[PDB]
Design a protein around this nucleic acid. Structure first.
Lengths: 131, 50, 61, 87, 196, 135
RNA sequence: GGUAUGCGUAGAAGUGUUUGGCGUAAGCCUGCAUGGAGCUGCCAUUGGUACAGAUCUUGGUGGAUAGUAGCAAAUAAUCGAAUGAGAGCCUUGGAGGACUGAAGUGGAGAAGGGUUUCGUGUGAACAGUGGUUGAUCACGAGUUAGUCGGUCCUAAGUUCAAGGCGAAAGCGAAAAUUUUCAAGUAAAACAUAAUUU
RNA sequence: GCCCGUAUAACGUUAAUGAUUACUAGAUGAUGUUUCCAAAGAGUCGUGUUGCUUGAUAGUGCAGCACUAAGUGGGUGGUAAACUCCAUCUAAAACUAAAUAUAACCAUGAGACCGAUAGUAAACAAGUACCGUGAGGGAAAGUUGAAAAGAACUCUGAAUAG
RNA sequence: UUAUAUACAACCUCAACUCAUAUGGGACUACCCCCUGAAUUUAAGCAUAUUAAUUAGGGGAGGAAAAGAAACUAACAAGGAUUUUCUUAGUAGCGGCGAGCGAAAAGAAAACAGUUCAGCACUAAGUCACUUUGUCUAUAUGGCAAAUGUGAGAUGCAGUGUA
RNA sequence: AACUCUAAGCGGUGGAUCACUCGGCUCAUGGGUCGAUGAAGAACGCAGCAAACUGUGCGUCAUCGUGUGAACUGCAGGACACAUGAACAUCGACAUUUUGAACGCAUAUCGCAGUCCAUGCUG
RNA sequence: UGCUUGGACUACAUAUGGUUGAGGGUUGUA
């Protein structure tokens, strides 16, 4: 658009999203926070975590549910939820994957590191409210 | 046979230890393209010579 | 590491340095005229850089 | 004389594996590697087999130190300095 | 601004066909050499084949730009200015104008100093053409081809133009509305004015 | 002279190309006699040359080599010019006394090709067609 | 590139068609049935632009035959028992007929093969017929040395120290000329002594 | 406006602009005038002549051979030869960042390009399966749906099956 | 110091060293550099021409390479280092005067940067490099003196001086 | 009903059409990076269940520091030694079997040495 | 001493010193 050093080509901007590396995915598996949580810290977006709480909004079930997560299958661009299950005819269920950009965060774990990411996101939007 | 040499004893393990089939679970990766092998040696339909 | 780090402190303060401890950088700037030693300007070229210096003016009306 | 009556009389190996090679090319008797040049001190290459060069060219596999060089000189050949924690 | 494109002057001719040929009632096209490997012959080297060169292809010096004249250019510029006004045929090539108050419209020079363009659609909404550019948001679409792999996704009908005399913030302000593509006076490049 | 290496009854192709037993080389001996130092001596550069004498079975020159990394010669900067990397082995690349003169170098109009860089880098310069951006 | 407030998961491209129609004709328009994500009309331009053909390239597939051609050299196999979903075999083990004839279809060695040798387990291609065993796979093990031998010696010969020549690579080469180009030798001053090409 | 991004920009690290201080190294001119000395590249120039080669022709240069230089000289002035001059340069010594070349190698974007019989020989476990002993020749093969939810269990056969 | 009868000291050519201490063949190649130099083709055939001072050609470099500070031009109301582009120009001549080849100062544009050697007179080797011992520090084949410890250096080192 | 002729339905061999493309080639701006301290290419040895491609070198699918800040995953099993870093990428630390330009004489032979200390047994 | 087990070593062309030098080469002091 203005700076020539970022492309737009269809191979090129799928080059660096499918076959991007295996820690940059956590920079890409983000989900929207809850609307009430947009006032405690007033930041839009955050990446999900492997033992946090996230909520379906736009999937098969449309969502009214609290739920934890077993793991973040970062090859498969996806995140499980420990109530969405479906069995085979054999009687064995798994967690049908639901991508981060269709789900909603309600509760994080605020550890020592995970608090420090909030303050890094703290003033950065608020600095852009000055102009 | 029977008067080989210490290349052709060690060369002949590598053209022996490569004569298994597919690893017998690894067709459950992501994007499994491996049905059965490319280098797969019989010994009368395929020669060695290199 | 301490088997390495003890060597290079006691192999300080010599010339004819250990081979495996001699700054493995490149090829095309090791063996060609070291840069403290390849700016050694000559006498009849440091007298024409003494008394008529570059003066930072603007020749304009 | 050449139909099939010479296919049982061709057993003696007359092209063994050479040292810095892997491709059977050393002609035992004349002691000369064919694809390269074992007793010659030069990878005998040519400017008319463009396709074959694409198998013995700079960048056909390992390139151990060459790969390292690319990165080292991109940082500025910074050596002996080690990093520090970020502040 | 045509770019270059070519098939790379080798291609097909990584080869050594020479003609195991005529006759054993397989055709004349020269034939790939030794084999064991589904390449004896199976035919390189000849433009009706599988792998062989396609017909004598684009040697990448062509008359690939074209050169114009100095007088016909501005004669085509002055025959675009005079297609701004006489406002009949600028309704008959799109651009619905049923609220604009002057043709050819000339605005006050105060509006060169607008800052945030949300305050500048207010300028256009108070020039009765914001419902015109609402035609453009309809017609953004997808290219017919083969647009959608070589990145040219699609476009829409370029809407209104606004010449600024001397820039203040406008070129950095207007650029976001789909269609408005502005200009300094002293350039007046052609095909921003009269597209196609 | 120099006899052309084809065996025993000479070249095929054309009668523009038969004659052997009088064919003459191009680079003079005073620039061959520095290749026959520069490769047998793997260590040193080449500076100039001068003849001494001549008799019928050799002409035979001298070579004034220069050392390259005697730790004196880095700090001797009136002859510092030759131990940059681009001047080493100046017997092949033709920038000794005779090897300069061998390739046809000066200016002007007894030398007018060679002018396009070196020598017959003329005869890749002038046949270089400029199919423009805008003709 | 311009354009039609262009249709598009309330079915867009091609695919069929015993729905219907327009042209002189190339070609469209249209209905139904698949199908699952993108497409055309006017007017400016234009590129590697429409195929029955080239003893045309490549990939399916016919008739003959999809059961015809022929699987005919090496004397020649046989009843009964197994087991097997199922046996002219091979797969066995019971008989007992004849071959190979000791310059064998027999026992072990070379070159070349490269895991075939062995047990265990077996479904389909593999064994120009079958298949319960196989030189196929599956799955396991399996090659021990002071004396056997490579290793030392040298044979025709590779021309393979730098005397030489060649623009360089290198030389379809009895390199016999190359300060000492000596292996040295328990040795002695004062090139250790006649010695080694 | 779901998400990174992209937009102006802030954050941060490294250089990069050195006022001064120190140490080290050197320097008085140009200026006109005439007094005294103005030294200059030696088998090379150049002619003959042979042989490639040139736009170069009674010669372009580059070469092997024979020759063998002069000091107010040597070349050079596109017709050879003296002969009169004139003009302009001073042979055989030596170095320098630039504006120029880039199918390489390394990170980078771009469009009137191709859509798996096309495009690099290969979109993928293509210089691999593979044949020739060799030099080397080199093909075939991309695209289940949103999710693997891959078809439990029952019946039949000895089974994959149905 | 040599009837070829001894020492020692130099010199001169010249060795040998598991001495010290250090430099180089190689990989790639598009571009570049000095090399060697062919052929179908065109002339309706072909032999000088052409393909071409060209593909292998391989020995050499680099982020530049070579050139470059004129033994040039031009002959004019003069110009003035080297390289690439536009034009000079498909014109001048070379040509089986066949096919076909083929430049050039001069005109304008980018960039611009000029100067050490040799050799009179330059007029106390006033030179240079190792060594060891410290100064000063630094991943320096390093900066200051010294013993003036060597040796190189008059068969000439240095300063000033150059078409 | 056999059979042969002909349309369509329908099943069947087939992979063409159209769509889709973690790729190709072309276009152009950027930067100097090639070894005697061991390059380039190969041979092998690799790991829990592993042939490859890719990664490496007895520290062998990764490696000190660094950065960012919780996983790779078919599965078992270890982690959560995030909180004093998962796993990545960066990458300066250290490492670099085997062979080349073979820096021992030397290769269809893992063969023959030679010097010197160290380290075990002769003794 | 000899064995086996580690290491370091031990190319050639070659430049400037270092050491020991070789010469009816050239003199000099005897």
């Amino acid at each position: 658009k203005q700076n020539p050093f970022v492309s737009s080509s269809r191979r090129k901007n799928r080059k660096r999203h499918f076959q991007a590396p295996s820690h940059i995915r956590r920079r890409l598996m983000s989900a929207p926070l809850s609307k009430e949580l947009r006032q405690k810290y007033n930041v839009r977006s955050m990446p999900i975590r492997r033992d946090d709480e996230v909520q379906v909004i736009r999937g098969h079930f449309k969502g009214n549910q609290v739920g934890k997560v077993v793991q973040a299958y970062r090859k498969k661009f996806v995140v499980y939820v420990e109530k969405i299950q479906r069995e085979n005819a054999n009687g064995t269920n798994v967690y049908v994957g639901i991508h981060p950009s269709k789900v909603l965060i309600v509760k994080l774990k605020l550890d020592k590191d995970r608090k420090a990411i909030l303050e890094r996101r703290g003033k950065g939007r608020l600095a852009a409210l000055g102009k | 046979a029977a008067h080989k040499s210490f290349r052709i004893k060690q060369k002949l393990a590598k053209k022996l230890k490569q004569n298994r089939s597919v690893p017998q679970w690894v067709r459950l990766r992501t994007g499994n393209t491996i049905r059965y092998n490319a280098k797969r040696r019989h010994w009368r339909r395929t020669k060695l010579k290199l | 590491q301490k088997q390495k780090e003890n060597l290079r402190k006691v192999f300080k303060n010599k010339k004819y340095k250990p081979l495996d401890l001699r700054k493995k950088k490149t090829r095309a700037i090791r063996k060609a005229l070291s840069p403290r030693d390849a700016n050694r300007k000559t006498l009849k070229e440091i007298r024409k850089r003494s008394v008529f210096p570059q003066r930072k003016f603007a020749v304009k009306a | 004389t050449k139909g099939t009556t010479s296919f049982g009389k061709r057993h003696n190996k007359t092209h063994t594996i050479c040292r810095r090679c892997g491709n059977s090319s050393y002609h035992l008797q004349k002691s000369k590697c064919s694809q390269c040049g074992y007793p010659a001190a030069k990878t005998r290459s040519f400017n008319w087999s463009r396709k074959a060069k694409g198998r013995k060219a700079q960048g056909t596999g390992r390139m151990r130190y060459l790969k390292n060089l690319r990165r080292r000189f991109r940082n500025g050949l910074r050596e002996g300095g080690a990093a520090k924690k970020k502040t | 601004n045509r770019q270059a494109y070519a098939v790379s002057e080798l291609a097909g001719h990584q080869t050594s066909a020479e003609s195991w040929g005529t006759g054993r009632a397989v055709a004349r096209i020269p034939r790939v050499r030794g084999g064991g490997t589904h390449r004896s012959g199976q035919g390189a080297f000849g433009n009706m084949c599988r792998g062989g060169r396609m017909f004598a292809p684009t040697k990448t010096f062509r008359r690939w730009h074209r050169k114009v004249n100095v007088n016909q250019r501005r004669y085509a510029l002055v025959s675009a200015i005079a297609a701004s006004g006489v406002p009949a045929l600028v309704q008959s090539k799109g651009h619905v104008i049923d609220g604009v108050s002057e043709f050819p419209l000339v605005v006050s020079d105060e509006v060169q100093k607008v800052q945030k363009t949300k305050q500048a659609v207010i300028f256009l909404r108070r020039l009765k053409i914001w419902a015109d550019i609402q035609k453009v948001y309809k017609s953004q679409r997808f290219r017919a081809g083969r647009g959608t792999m070589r990145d040219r996704r699609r476009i829409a009908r370029r809407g209104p133009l606004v010449v600024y005399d001397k820039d203040e913030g406008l070129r950095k302000a207007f650029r976001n509305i789909p269609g408005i593509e502005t200009i300094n006076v002293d350039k007046l490049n052609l095909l921003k004015l009269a597209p196609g | 002279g120099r006899k052309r290496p084809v065996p025993k009854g000479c070249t095929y192709g054309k009668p523009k190309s038969h004659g052997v037993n009088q064919l003459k080389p191009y680079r003079g001996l005073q620039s061959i006699a520095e290749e026959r130092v520069g490769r047998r001596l793997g260590g040193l550069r080449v500076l100039n040359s001068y003849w001494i004498a001549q008799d019928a079975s050799y002409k035979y020159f001298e070579v004034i080599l220069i050392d390259t990394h005697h730790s004196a010669i880095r700090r001797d900067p009136k002859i510092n010019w030759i131990c940059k990397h681009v001047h080493k082995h100046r017997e092949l690349r033709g920038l000794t006394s005779a090897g300069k003169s061998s390739r046809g170098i000066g200016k002007g109009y007894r030398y007018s090709q060679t002018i396009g860089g070196s020598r017959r880098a003329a005869w890749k310069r002038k046949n270089r067609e400029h199919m423009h951006r805008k003709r």
